[PDB]
Design a protein around this ligand. Structure first.
Ligand code: BTN
Ligand code: BTN
Ligand code: BTN
Ligand code: BTN
Lengths: 118, 118, 118, 117
């Protein structure tokens, strides 16, 4: 259900595998920001969700360090998978950048991403 | 610096190992919410941080299912590791429940946790 | 043209008046949660925005108490007015409920609402 | 008990009076950021909170423009007042900047402020 290739509205690409385990491993590619190429991601999801039509809860993290670049920052996404004719993953995310502590008040960005199968 | 046992203001236990590749592995134990004993965590962090006194960006995830129970939910922490007088990890987090499409507007909580080694 | 009647994706109604001194006044009606009928709102906005195509920052608050019910909660919306063809207000919101000390960790929901005039 | 002068962990000064209609009005002076002097704030609070000892739900907004500068931003604070000897106002905030559509994804900062007397 979750395993496969997913696209968000910014055009980043998300490529995951869900292990029978509860694990999320894959790579991420961002259309925007101080990013170039694919980054390692990792996460967890509910491998035994409710069968009432409720969504499947999950999350993952990306640190923006790869051989190409280091933005000194990390994003985590927290959301739920929703199956159907139009499967979706609706998410909210937090992007934190390393700042000195005098500038810590401005270290974190928030937003939302929606990923679809097409 | 990062690897070790951390406690937050809530009394939760964050047992983390920082692998040289930027991986975070370990185990989380919450003293609040619909949870008991240890849950698997995974995450990532900036393995080559900045030297200007800036802190170290990181993030991780817990999906709240183990051998004893399943809350059908997931939490992600995003924040930064700061050295100094005493070590600390400052985070903001997002916690999403699996819900129906109708209840999704109230699926996600937000907070901030401060982890220290005491 | 912030002044006017808007709706979001839940079907709630946002009726506003934007002052020349930079004030926002009006009523809010929600289609979901612990609410019925109209509620007072108040906010501020940038009265002298940038003319470089940037949107106009604004924000407002609703305390969910009127003559018919009281949910012991307040929602603040923070976002911007996008002028043009399809005028929209894009927001992110924080909904805080009054809680006991026990429950403060779970006091605050985060989400996002999109308002249009259609 | 919300009325008066409050300071947060950043050294900023919040001067506010709470109206009997659940109105919040006053002044904010930020110790940090693209700011100088005072700014008008306005917001709302639960004027009949739960008598179980729950905190008092509130929020306010500051747009960062005065006669000295205009930062083209607005912050909203959402939180609860908690009375008693260590009275506090515990908040989470959203700081949104005017952006072009291409940079909307990074328009909004999130933080937390604890105000104390
Ligand atoms: O630090 C950087 O600028 C790189 C971060 C990548 C941009 C973000 S992560 C949240 C949002 N969703 C995306 O697909 N891209 C942006
Ligand atoms: O669904 C549940 O109730 C279990 C989630 C655990 C509660 C949270 S996660 C954020 C915060 N930090 C903690 O240590 N515990 C709570
Ligand atoms: O349930 C409450 O505590 C009061 C009603 C809250 C309604 C919320 S505010 C965010 C979202 N957008 C809406 O139009 N309604 C909900
Ligand atoms: O830089 C700007 O855009 C205007 C100043 C913003 C200051 C912020 S608002 C949240 C936080 N709390 C404070 O007291 N100051 C900062």
């Amino acid at each position: 259900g979750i395993t496969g290739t997913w696209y968000n509205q910014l055009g980043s690409t998300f490529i995951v595998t869900a292990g029978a385990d509860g694990a999320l491993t894959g790579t991420y590619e961002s259309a925007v920001g101080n990013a170039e190429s694919r980054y390692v991601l990792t996460g967890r999801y509910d491998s035994a969700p409710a069968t009432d039509g409720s969504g499947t809860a999950l999350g993952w993290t990306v640190a923006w360090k790869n051989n190409y670049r280091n933005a000194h920052s990390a994003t985590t996404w927290s959301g739920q998978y929703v199956g159907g004719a139009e499967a979706r993953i609706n998410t909210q995310w937090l992007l934190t950048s390393g700042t000195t502590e005098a500038n810590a008040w401005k270290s974190t960005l928030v937003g939302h991403d929606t990923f679809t199968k097409v």
